[PDB]
Amino acid sequence: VARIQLLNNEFVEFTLSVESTGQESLEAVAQRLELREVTYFSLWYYNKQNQRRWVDLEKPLKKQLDKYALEPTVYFGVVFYVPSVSQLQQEITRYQYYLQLKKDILEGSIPCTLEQAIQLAGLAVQADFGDFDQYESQDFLQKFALFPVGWLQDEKVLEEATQKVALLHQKYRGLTAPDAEMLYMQEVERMDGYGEESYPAKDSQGSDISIGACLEGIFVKHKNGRHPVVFRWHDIANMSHNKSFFALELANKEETIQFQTEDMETAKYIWRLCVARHKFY
Site for Cl ion, rule CB under 5 A = 276
Q: How far apart are CA 85 and CA 104, in angstroms?
A: 15
The nearest distance, CB 42 to Cl ion, in angstroms, is: 5
The nearest distance, CB 33 to Cl ion, in angstroms, is: 19
Q: How far apart are CA 26 and CA 14, in angstroms?
A: 12
- Contact in structure between 178 and 94 (CB atoms under 8 Å): yes
The nearest distance, CB 205 to Cl ion, in angstroms, is: 31
Scanning 58-217, the segments in alpha helix (DSSP H) are 61-68, 91-106, 114-129, 155-171, 177-189
- In a 3-state reduction of DSSP, which class is residue 184? helix
For Cl ion, give the closer residue by CB, 33 or 276.
276
For Cl ion, give the closer residue by CB, 215 or 276.
276
The nearest distance, CB 44 to Cl ion, in angstroms, is: 10
The nearest distance, CB 41 to Cl ion, in angstroms, is: 10
For Cl ion, give the closer residue by CB, 32 or 59.
59
For Cl ion, give the closer residue by CB, 184 or 269.
269
Q: Is 193 left (phi over 0), alpha (psi -120 to 50) or beta?
A: left
The nearest distance, CB 273 to Cl ion, in angstroms, is: 6
For Cl ion, give the closer residue by CB, 7 or 183.
7
Q: Which residue is nearest to Cl ion (CB)?
A: 276
For Cl ion, give the closer residue by CB, 92 or 276.
276
For Cl ion, give the closer residue by CB, 98 or 269.
269
Residues 6+ apart with CB under 8 A from 133: 173
Residues 6+ apart with CB under 8 A from 36: 30, 90, 92, 93
The nearest distance, CB 182 to Cl ion, in angstroms, is: 26
Q: How far apart are CA 211 and CA 132, in angstroms?
A: 44
What is the maximum span of the chain, computed from C-alpha positions, in angstroms? Answer: 66
Label each residue of 34-57 as H, E or C: CCCCCCCEEEEEEECCCCEEECCC
